[PDB]
Amino acid sequence: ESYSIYVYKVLKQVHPDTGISSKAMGIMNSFVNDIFERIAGEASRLAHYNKRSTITSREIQTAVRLLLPGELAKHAVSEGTKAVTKYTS
Amino acid sequence: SRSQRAGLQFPVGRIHRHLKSRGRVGATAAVYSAAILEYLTAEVLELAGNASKDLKVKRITPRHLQLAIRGDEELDSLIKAT
Amino acid sequence: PRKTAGNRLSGLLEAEEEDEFYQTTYGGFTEESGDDEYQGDTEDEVDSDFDIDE
Numbered sequence: 001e002s003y004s005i006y007v008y009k010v011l012k013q014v015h016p017d018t019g020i021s022s023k024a025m026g027i028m029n030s031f032v033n034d035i036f037e038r039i040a041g042e043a044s045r046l047a048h049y050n051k052r053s054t055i056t057s058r059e060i061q062t063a064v065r066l067l068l069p070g071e072l073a074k075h076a077v078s079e080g081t082k083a084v085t086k087y088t089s
Numbered sequence: 090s091r092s093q094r095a096g097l098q099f100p101v102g103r104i105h106r107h108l109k110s111r112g113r114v115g116a117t118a119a120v121y122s123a124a125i126l127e128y129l130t131a132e133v134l135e136l137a138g139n140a141s142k143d144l145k146v147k148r149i150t151p152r153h154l155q156l157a158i159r160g161d162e163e164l165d166s167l168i169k170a171t
Numbered sequence: 172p173r174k175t176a177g178n179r180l181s182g183l184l185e186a187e188e189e190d191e192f193y194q195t196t197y198g199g200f201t202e203e204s205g206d207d208e209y210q211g212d213t214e215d216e217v218d219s220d221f222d223i224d225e
């Protein structure tokens with residue numbers, strides 16, 4: 001799947017005056033896709049483990065906590081919860 | 090958009106479709122997923138745009154991405170476990 | 172005590188040995204000759220079962 005355009009929206013948010021090369025953009029899209037597959041596969045097995053029919057932010061939080069190291073898991077849990085909160089609110 | 094409601098740049102509905110292609114998948118799973126992916130993209134990008142001695146990179150190339158990821162103990166270990 | 176002590180040490184150690192990981196991963200993190208800038212149906216696409224009762 002392609003996420004290159006959303007990687008660009010983030011790039012313009014972090015570094016408004018910074019560009020990105022095509023190879024570089026392809027690597028970003030490959031990294032986003034590789035991480036997506038890990039998280040998904042992980043949430044998939046937790047829903048399997050708990051006999052759950054619906055995958056929710058609970059499985060994603062559990063997956064993030066398992067696969068993301070150190071300070072990254074703590075911050076990505078704060079970012080995911082915050083986003084779900086402002087969507088559900 | 091639904092992505093704006095969650096305060097994100099990442100496509101929530103597209104991420105929901107990708108999750109389903111990998112039983113039900115709820116909006117929260119899609120919103121939480123977009124948020125974490127957006128988080129990591131922003132962490133990788135923040136560093137690469139600052140991968141200079143003057144800290145000013147005009148255009149991000151694969152050398153900057155290698156400096157960003159390899160230049161970070163946690164991104165390096167994340168990418169390597171993957 | 173020094174908030175700046177060992178400033179670059181961790182990176183110099185990382186740099187000591189070549190990482191083949193960054194040479195193969197996603198096609199390798201190496202600059203190409205002719206590596207142009209990235210250019211510019213963009214919006215989100217939502218299915219019927221997005222907002223189902225979880």
